[PDB]
Design a protein around this ligand. Structure first.
Ligand code: SDD
Ligand code: SDD
Ligand code: SDD
Ligand code: SDD
Ligand code: MN
Ligand code: MN
Ligand code: MN
Ligand code: MN
Ligand code: MN
Ligand code: MN
Ligand code: MN
Ligand code: MN
Lengths: 288, 290, 289, 290
């Protein structure tokens, strides 16, 4: 089982010097660094090439996360936005291929954060979304990428809030490259059972995000890690597990994540690295 | 210990025929019915008295919940809005006195739902609100009403997200009639420890909301009810416990609570009643004594 | 599911006026009353028939538990003992048949409590037990009785301490009416996973005892009830669930169960009744899907 | 806090080459090695000193555990036995002083394992034990040793089974060098609440043993480690945390601990080393601060 961390645990914006984090994460022992997709369309082939070489040189595998903007919304009623959305993932998936990245995840079937002042048409968005994703999946297949649909809590999405919904949506899409992605932070709000959600995901589970109830590093909170380890084994999960802790206020990230108190308690970079490493030790011990 | 349920469990709007629910609730065995405050300002003294009369007749105690509108936002930098807010509350409080309800709770220090497409000024809203609430605290005291500030999760508010912040804020307000309020649904998100949060609230805890991780009635979910019960015994809690389940899509309630799937699983009113009563027995059994 | 309670929750000896308890549990709403086997061998035909009629007239099903004496030890190396044991069970099972009882459970593959003053021979005891149980099974079968082997903690038995061991032992016996029986109080000690244990027992699970970690009535302690209910659902368990609370000091029961403090907090009979009933309500509410 | 492991994790008899284990746990990274008191009485002053020196050299602190024999029973109604027991501990304590050991724990107020064959007289034994312990306490104070009374499950002792009973006994003894000692294995069986037991022990808590429900190394079982960490922080625990895993069949340890299956599942010495090391990391991580 491969273990990673989202670079944003250290940064307040959806972009960073990924080569720097690739190096940090390697020294700390992770197998994976997960990066945000948004600066990738602004990279020259030269940059893509060197990011790839840097990760390869450091033994790090790269996975991608992405919170789509309203304009990249595959479920939109506006046919133009859906058109632009498809172009965006087509381009992006192509870059992922160049980067030798085989996994992308997040609210890929919608956009994030969601605007609730707006009027919600779930039934509508759900059908348009399923339709758009199947097309994109063609490209994903072609690019050797698993398109992972993350199940999110009610306050961050209205389309898919439980693993059962995720499975229904994926089955309905019905394409090899579209998987379900669960996240302990989100399962904690919506699920009747954590082990049950994993088991429901079953073979469809393609990626796993981890964090405590309030998004701290895995291990000293209330998440039922031992139960998760059991369930993952029950379903023979071989995928990767990426922690995505958010413990700092300020910035696009602090705001989007709604961190309104310093949950890190003044942690400095060295401190942050220490806890992430300890949490990585915990995860390998407990989850496998 | 006194147990109640919020009338919204059965309705999709922030008002309804309370007399109807008082009767249903007395029949299912609850001690309390919690009602939404919004319609109360438009009650004639006659209908206020009939409500109070209904409750007394059915042996039910009434408590009130309230999600403030932006215009009622006591923390708003706009002084006109603060004015409307404080005026609104004193009329409401005075009315509560007439209906002999001694408890109101909710994001009373802010507004709800919150508009997150706006820029957040926590420290600013925080000092304003503290000043605003202390002021309101006086009318609350004269009306014999406990003004409870409910700790909410990050997605529903940004001023008070943990019991520690609720206590800091209530100690700052520094007034006898202002209490911290906890909700198992909100604690499940923000707290390192449920039992620890209750012990942190301690003497200041004046009200408690219950619901499973996903807002189903208490009982078959992951919320740690026994730890809650033991922590309530640790502090010596003397308030009531109101379950606030939300399992239905639709209306302002469904959209305000973000119920995007049929969590009730097709329940008709009679099934909704069965489940509420069973959770009532569960709660009296698991949360008491220790 | 069918829910019961063990009569000993109200008594300090391994026998009592079962009719009194049948009337009691029926009014409290239980489906089952579980009774101790020990006085049955001394029940005359009409006493047996009267107990049966009492159960039937009250909508109550009777189940049976037994802590075997050393003289009833089917795993004994002494062949005479094994012979006496087979004869004791044979007679008992025929009595259960007259009682219209179809389930007996406990450390039926050994004896209880164990004298840990004697040297253990697990392997030898295990093989003799498998043999003896095989032939007793044949008698139970003909009597219409499921023979349930209860998995116990290490301080009360050395042969079968985990659901996995109970499954191994039962597969070896290889008789359809012989089953694995789990108990929340014993799993709490020996199992890595509660739900895991239940899923391990699976189709072989034939009976379930409940109690908190310290044997208080189910619901207000640390036992993972919700996890248990989910796992029972996964294996499709539809059998019986008998709570076995022990909250009082004194007598053979207090001594055998090792209750060395008043866990009941001065509860009187009516107080004990109210608790059981609340626990029944809880069990029915939380354990079913 | 300082973390340790009981040497018996690797041995099947209540004795062993302690020097060897001191060097083993130093390399594995532990702060402490806990050893059985049994062989200490047979130690020349030369032996004592090298052990003391071996510990000091590897930066390992030594703590002592002891399962008293019937002849060492301080609660015994036979005055000759109580006499011999005082003699035994007064000497053991003098030796501990020479080893610079500041802590000893186990069923020091009774004997272990107990013969549940005899007639148990809890009330009598309790009073005898209280008085005897208090006397021994004097010798402990003089030798600068903390006399830790471990609370055990009903199958292994009948005098003290819950932290509440432990605090009562200790408060009755009324002596500064007598502490309550808790063990996650035993609390898991007898306590309503784990965090609650720890808070109940509070300042009387002088030592803590850890292990999963079935005695594997801490970490992948059902013990509520976080709740424990949080409770220890609630009481500002000022002590050591020693893991006491028992995963091997055979010998007096296999028999006394009642290991009737290979819970280690084939582990060789290296494997055990690794698992204990992972458990250590787990423990410092999960149990610290909060
Ligand atoms: O869990 C999520 C946010 O609530 C997402 O996984 C987010 O963090 C990604 O950065 C984009 O979807
Ligand atoms: O918990 C709450 C909303 O998340 C509130 O308690 C809400 O349900 C009331 O209706 C308004 O305070
Ligand atoms: O659980 C058991 C004792 O530990 C048994 O189930 C016992 O209580 C019965 O009375 C005899 O097996
Ligand atoms: O936990 C204990 C008994 O089960 C004791 O701590 C024991 O393991 C020691 O060896 C007795 O000193
Ligand atoms: Mn995520
Ligand atoms: Mn609430
Ligand atoms: Mn309790
Ligand atoms: Mn109780
Ligand atoms: Mn049992
Ligand atoms: Mn111990
Ligand atoms: Mn913490
Ligand atoms: Mn922390």
């Amino acid at each position: 089982m491969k273990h990673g961390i989202y670079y944003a645990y250290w940064e307040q914006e959806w972009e960073a010097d990924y080569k720097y984090y690739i190096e940090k994460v390697a020294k700390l022992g992770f197998d994976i660094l997960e990066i945000a997709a948004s600066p990738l369309p602004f990279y020259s082939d030269i940059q893509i090439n060197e990011l790839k070489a840097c990760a390869h040189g450091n033994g790090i595998t790269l996975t991608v996360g992405h919170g789509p903007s309203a304009e990249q919304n595959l479920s939109s009623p506006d046919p133009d936005i859906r058109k632009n959305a498809k172009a965006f993932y087509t381009d992006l998936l192509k870059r992922l291929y160049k980067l030798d990245v085989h996994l992308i995840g997040g609210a890929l079937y919608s956009y994030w954060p969601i605007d609730y002042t707006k009027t919600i048409d779930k039934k509508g968005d759900w059908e348009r979304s399923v339709e758009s994703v199947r097309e994109v999946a063609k490209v994903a297949e072609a690019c050797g990428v698993d398109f992972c649909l993350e199940v999110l809590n009610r306050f961050e999405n209205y389309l898919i809030n439980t693993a059962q919904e995720g499975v229904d949506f994926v089955k309905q899409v019905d394409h090899n490259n579209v998987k379900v992605m669960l996240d302990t932070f989100h399962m904690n709000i919506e699920e009747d059972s954590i082990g049950g959600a994993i088991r429901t995901a079953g073979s469809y589970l393609g990626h796993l995000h981890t964090g405590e109830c309030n998004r701290k590093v895995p291990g000293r909170g209330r998440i039922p890690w031992v139960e998760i380890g059991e369930a993952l084994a029950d379903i023979g999960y071989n995928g990767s597990v990426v922690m995505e802790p958010f413990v700092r206020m300020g910035g696009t990230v602090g705001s989007n994540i709604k961190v309104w108190r310093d949950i890190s308690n003044g942690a400095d970079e060295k401190m942050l690295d220490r806890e992430a490493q300890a949490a990585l030790d915990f995860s390998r011990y407990v989850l496998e």
